Subunit: 396 residues, 4 copies
């Protein structure tokens, strides 16, 4: 015969009709493999102009992402978003700590509470620039002590006493990219400014319902005042929502609502769509304007991610799934028996182990379906080459 | 493009076809926000002639509503229903305690078991009326003691020794509205009478199956004998049921069956429809006659309420969800660890904190969908502007 | 308007199409009440010729029904089925103990291990017959002892030392009806005979798959040899199955498979249909020949029963649901805390409290839908007057 | 009437349309029995040329199958697959231990760590061949010791000091069949060779996604180099997958993915179809080329097996379900209370009790539906004579 029937449904005929499907309600029928997983290119687009080596993005949650988390996240091919549950000052400070982080040089010396190296952030208190970490790394040995204060040719930078990150994510001026979330109220315009000044690359307008006149004007504002800053619009779950925000000027959309971790109020309130039908719906529209979508919320394993990207998502934001990694802010562990952490509002190794592990699964995931890039995975579903199968309740 | 497709299903095409949907089987896709939540008007109709500032209503359950509960409930914008698991006398007494409650004046002085202020409910045993609480509140100071017996200009009323309730619910004669449930047996006609005399504003005919010749005649009776009393018909779940009761004369319908808390017998018996398809179905009919519907049963969070009202409900009755508030009758707490209360038949702060909190969520709920009033939320669904999405088992 | 739409689905359009519905997958929309529950006539047909006052029937399980259970069961309006996990002799003995039980007279005197009243089952060892229990009940007083051996006018019956059962179930010769289950192997023909001789009214051919050449011939056999004995055919779940058995001669069908309690092997094996689609399907066919159906298995509450009968069932068999009653054979209780009993193979008051309680719920169940008899409930569904509503997984 | 309607759906109309059904989402409506279960012929085809008496096959898991397990498995009518989590040498050794096992003769004497019988695997260190176990079994008695070293007529085989297996599975040269799994990497070609030399009958290419250029070439290779060796292709779940592998030359397909036990990575990853829709789909295609399918994964009880075979499967592979049997490799038991075993990666009696028990249920399963052979069960479903019924979530 050599004919072989036909299987699965096309993403459309499956996600565009009275569904309400979550990541666990379907699977993706496998294809033909003819290459190894390592060749699976994960290059993803965070925003129109910003692009990462991997599609991983950590959440602006007070328990997930902070200066530490963001840095590792960028070095490992992703990006982090500094939350905003702290005075604008301390947050914009966290951005700097990251935007300044040069692989090697100790950042955040100890002047006076934000051992003490006395001085005035460039005023010799107590090392020629342009030198390679090697030169000084040895110089310290003869210094018969440890560190070594660096500075310009006029006694006016920082200190320092297998570190390769081939995929890390820097900006034009070779610096780890960093983002942060803000609100849409007035007070945020200041906060934003401080952040802008601290060197932030992208600002995501943090909100449960981003389709408000408030988020709109906030977009237009930023888009105008700061033409060199990518803005990510409030949380949406439909195209009717994405439209405005896209017209207001967003450079990416953050999809998700009634998914992931809750804080207070009502995560499952009146409104709260399944994170698959949403990602599919919203992306399908967003792509029409070249606006990427971040699948924010509801990721528990690598599989979820593959599925997230396969439906139209360019990147995927995770919170909890990352919280257990060490680079997450906190302390309230019990080593006697089991897992319990604390989350507050208004185990799992270094991210340098975790992220590499995710990328493996994601590449492997793209391999099983015969795809060699997150882009060929998306092209395959919009074409119908990629076939899905729905799973029953009892089934699951 | 600027076109943007179409999403969700209209409430009809979703609730009028072999469904059997509960509050958790669907969500409500969000709209466009362009105003703040506080502007969300919750004015709701309890009955044809009675109207509250909020849509909240507490249940005639021996563990949920009693004189205390009702009072707070009315002051905070709702209304309570005194249960009827007590001799007609003690119940009709509870009504008075509420209908008499004047913000300030101590009610239910201690004559002789229903410190003692001796007298004869107006016969000087042991204060000029028309006086403002301030006048006497000071007078007591000079009285060098505490209280102060008040009375008419003929030595023949009561005593007294940020209290603002802008939204409280009073009747023409400025008094906290109060309701109570009764049965449809003979003995209830007396009970009813006592209640009528105690000043009750609405009487809800308590019953699992309200479409009986018994409830009908009971309606007609009351409607006749007491032309100034709003009657709420037995529990229904279809339009065929609501019809009779509406024709018998009801001024509101109480929808619900096989939902919420159980007592004895069979809550899930042969008959017991999902509280969403029912609220939708019954309301759709009731509105045709100007008869409001109380969505009674199955409310666990604010979300449920928004969904309840969005489907056609004018008000929502809660029992358990309120039981933990302090104004609920009881005592059997354990402060060592967790929740356990007792319910008997034939934690959570003051209601002045809870109700305000519900109203917040409900207003917020109306905000997310772009509605500015519970009425514009209903108008939007009957029009199809409001769009829903069904959720799978596995999904949920 | 006074029109009122249309609701629910007819039993057919709901149970005759790719369903596989269990008792919990649907509910029964309520009707109009215009009479009290006590007027709800539960007269049901166990077999073509045998008819009970109630539709209750206890299972031939070694832990549910035995001489004790059967007796109470018959007195309270039902019937029991003595299991067959004991030599044919002891089982056929249990039948007699029941077929002999006369309200008042002590049965099973103590001759010599099957205080001792010496004799030879009618041979004066150590009272005029036709006497009323009153006569002798007093006679014993003057006898200055206790009991009183009775006998024929030739010194050759039994002894004896608010008992009204208006609904009990007797045969022509005024004796509590009693049934028992047997197998279809050879050895059973003897067993059967002994039973036949002991006075059994109906024999149910105990089997997981009753549509076998074995059960068929076993039917034909009994039907022939004993023309005055009602036979209940092996367990079935389709009409194709019921046909043969009906043609072989059965006088009732026992529907059920992959439901209720398990013993060994595979209750949920390859084959094992939902007990609702089955009861509906099989009954629909059985009724065509005047052959009643016993809904055997899967009953946890009164509701289940109403639903069972409403779909076409004439009677309902229960096992576990009755096991906790006292009349059930056993002992392995712990009064310190909770429920645990033992079931072995190859709390809850007297049945005089339980059965009356079931009948209440069943009558009440028939009331809610507006039916006055189990027969008018069935007539209403086959007509479509009775309307059902399916319930989702997440719903349930 | 004597007509009797129509029930169930044909396997196609049920498994070839947006389903995603697992073994528990449906049941198989019973037929007509007219023969005893013991007459139910279970002869099944493992591969084109290899055929067993039963359809049972144990998994190549480091915790399920090893030399011991395989032997019993073959003797009881099945076959085992030696896993490959050990150097090629120790694995190929396990094959020999099995391919050599002659019912009676002690195998694997103790020369020197792979009491000691000194020698050189045939070089007299320290019995005429062709002798019956009886001859020597007695000879040992006069030997006044125990064992007895056997050898050729030139002092150059083995030793030895109700054993009937009517259904055991041997090859042409009367030896227990044995198989083993290998990978598709280079290193496996050696491993394979050693195995080939050890006498293995079938090699299953162990892989999560068997439709790779790697598995293909690996097939072609083996098929060529070893024309007398049956090859079982990587794990598949569609026909598009099976095609290649079949064209590459496989002699059987191993169906399954996202089912059973997990090890590491993502069992439920992007891809992972329900083991029923898959078995149905893949078999339907495979049978077109005479290529049998092993339903690998997701078996918890006999029922599952019957269902597995009924949908198109020729054999069924089990892992966990067998792990608890004694012939499974291991030790980490607690006899104080309950079940816990250990599974590691890169109770339940002898299999001589278990396998016989499975065969019973499987025969019984075929009986209930009226089938007398696993083949007539398959022929009945492809014809539509065999009818299925879907089960709801809530149902299940
Ligand atoms: N990070 C996320 O993606 C996400 C998702 C869900 C909930 N949340 C959190 O839950 C909290 C409460 O719910 P939310 O998300 O709707 O809060 P939000 O920050 O989106 O704003 C809440 C409401 O206040 C009003 N508002 C906002 N800015 C205003 C302004 N400048 N002037 C006047 N009114 C203004 C709007 O009605 C808005 O709905 C948020 O503060 C947010 O931190 C965040
Ligand atoms: N509050 C509610 O909305 C609600 C809901 C479900 C159950 N329940 C409680 O469960 C209890 C038992 O079930 P119910 O709700 O059907 O009880 P009910 O009060 O509605 O009456 C029970 C039955 O008694 C009969 N009856 C009622 N009044 C009669 C009269 N005057 N004369 C003759 N017969 C009369 C009717 O057959 C009626 O179905 C009720 O008493 C009620 O308190 C209440
Ligand atoms: N009581 C019930 O309704 C019910 C339901 C499910 C299982 N069971 C119990 O499970 C046990 C095992 O399964 P089952 O119900 O199929 O058992 P069964 O009593 O129906 O007989 C089992 C098998 O033995 C064969 N057989 C029966 N009588 C025979 C005869 N006279 N000559 C030759 N062969 C004969 C038939 O193949 C039959 O399928 C049964 O003994 C029964 O007690 C009972
Ligand atoms: N036994 C089963 O049926 C089964 C099912 C699921 C998972 N697993 C286990 O999970 C492990 C990891 O996942 P997997 O099943 O995809 O592993 P695998 O053995 O199928 O190979 C993994 C990947 O390595 C590459 N590869 C394989 N052979 C190669 C070669 N010769 N040259 C270059 N590249 C090659 C391919 O991309 C392949 O997808 C496997 O090793 C397997 O043991 C087994
Ligand atoms: O998918 P997880 O990681 O569980 O959820 C993380 C996401 O959930 C949302 N979220 C986090 N904290 C929250 C508090 N309240 C409401 N939503 C929150 C954000 O969208 C965040 O990116
Ligand atoms: O939704 P909750 O608060 O759980 O349920 C409260 C409602 O349940 C019903 N109810 C309360 N007590 C009951 C006892 N028995 C049967 N129904 C009861 C009433 O309709 C009451 O308003
Ligand atoms: O519905 P319950 O009471 O749980 O189940 C009782 C019924 O289950 C079946 N049954 C009882 N014991 C069994 C052992 N094995 C298989 N089925 C049994 C019989 O049909 C019995 O009437
Ligand atoms: O159905 P059970 O016995 O749970 O699963 C056994 C099957 O699961 C798969 N399997 C076993 N160990 C595994 C580790 N990782 C992934 N799959 C495995 C194999 O297909 C194996 O035959």
């Amino acid at each position: 015969t050599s004919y072989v029937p036909d299987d699965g449904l096309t993403a459309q005929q499956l996600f565009n009709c009275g569904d309400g499907l979550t990541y666990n309600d379907f699977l993706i029928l496998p294809g033909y493999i003819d290459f190894t997983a390592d060749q699976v290119d994960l290059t993803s687009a965070l925003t129109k102009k910003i692009t990462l080596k991997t599609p991983l993005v950590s959440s602006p949650m007070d328990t997930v992402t902070e200066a530490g988390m963001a840095i590792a996240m960028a070095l490992t091919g992703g990006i982090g978003f500094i939350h905003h549950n702290c005075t604008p000052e301390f947050q914009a400070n966290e951005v700097r700590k990251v935007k300044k982080y040069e692989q090697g040089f100790i950042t955040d010396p100890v002047v006076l509470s934000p051992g003490i190296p006395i001085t005035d952030t460039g005023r010799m208190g107590s090392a020629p620039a342009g030198i390679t970490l090697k030169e000084a790394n040895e110089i310290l040995q003869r210094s018969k002590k440890g560190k070594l204060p660096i500075v310009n040719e006029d006694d006016e930078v920082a200190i320092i006493a297998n570190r390769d990150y081939p995929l890390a994510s820097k900006d034009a001026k070779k610096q780890l990219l960093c983002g942060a979330a803000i609100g849409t109220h007035e007070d945020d315009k200041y906060r934003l400014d401080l952040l802008a000044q601290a060197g932030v690359d992208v600002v995501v307008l943090d909100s449960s319902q981003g389709n408000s006149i408030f988020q709109i004007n906030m977009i237009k504002y930023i888009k105008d005042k700061y033409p060199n800053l990518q803005v990510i619009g409030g949380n949406v779950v439909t195209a009717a929502q994405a439209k405005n925000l896209i017209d207001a000027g967003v450079d990416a959309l953050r999809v998700g609502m009634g998914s992931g971790s809750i804080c207070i109020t009502q995560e499952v309130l009146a409104c709260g769509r399944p994170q698959a039908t949403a990602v599919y719906k919203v992306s399908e529209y967003a792509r029409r304007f070249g606006v990427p979508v971040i699948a924010d919320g509801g990721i528990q394993n690598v599989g979820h991610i593959a599925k997230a990207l396969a439906l139209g998502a360019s990147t995927v934001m995770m919170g909890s799934l990352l919280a257990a990694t060490t680079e997450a802010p906190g302390e309230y562990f019990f080593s006697d028996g089991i897992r319990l952490k604390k989350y507050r509002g208004m185990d799992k190794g270094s991210i340098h182990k975790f992220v590499p592990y995710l990328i493996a699964g994601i590449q492997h995931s793209c391999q099983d379906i015969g795809a060699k890039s997150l882009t060929q995975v998306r092209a395959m579903m919009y074409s119908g080459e990629l076939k899905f199968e729905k799973r029953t309740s009892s089934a699951q």
